[PDB]
């Protein structure tokens, strides 16, 4: 589990860039800060600051990918089958 | 409206001041890049 601190590539001009899909997350277990991937910028809309995100193993140096946000699967959100509870 | 090419520069007083300060700096130490006879 992790806390979304900031979306580093939110401002990058080239759409769907590798940088655009990275989110800076703080691991709750130990508080260390790590970087995680999002499947696409379309999914990056769902992720916003200060949500609990479930990370899984996967620009080199990024070894994690987000699988759930706020207890709901991103793929479920991306396929318009669920709503993110807030 | 977008521009296609660089605008023609204008010689304002600040530009002349910077240029003449440049020349004075160069000449103070006699830093001249001039052709030398072989």
């Amino acid at each position: 589990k992790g806390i979304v601190l900031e979306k580093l590539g939110i401002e990058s001009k080239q759409p769907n860039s590798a940088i655009r899909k990275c989110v800076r997350v703080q691991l709750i277990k130990n508080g260390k800060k790590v970087t995680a991937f999002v499947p696409n910028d379309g999914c990056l809309n769902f992720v916003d600051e200060n949500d609990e995100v479930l990370l899984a193993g996967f620009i080199p140096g990024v070894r994690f990918k987000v699988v759930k946000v706020s207890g709901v699967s991103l793929l479920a959100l991306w396929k318009e089958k669920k709503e993110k509870p807030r | 409206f977008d521009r296609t090419a660089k605008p023609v520069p204008v010689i304002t007083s600040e530009v002349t001041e910077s240029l003449e300060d440049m020349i004075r700096r160069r000449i103070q130490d006699s830093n001249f890049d001039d052709l030398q006879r072989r």
Partner: peptide, 29 residues
């Protein structure tokens, strides 16, 4: 006059973005 201002303005926007991209990519890796 406006043409010179835009090119000068766009120059700073591009320079900051490239520098501000560079810092972000450095931090991630």
């Amino acid at each position: 006059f406006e043409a010179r201002q835009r090119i000068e303005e766009k120059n700073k926007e591009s320079s900051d973005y490239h520098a501000k991209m560079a810092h972000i990519v450095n931090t991630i890796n």
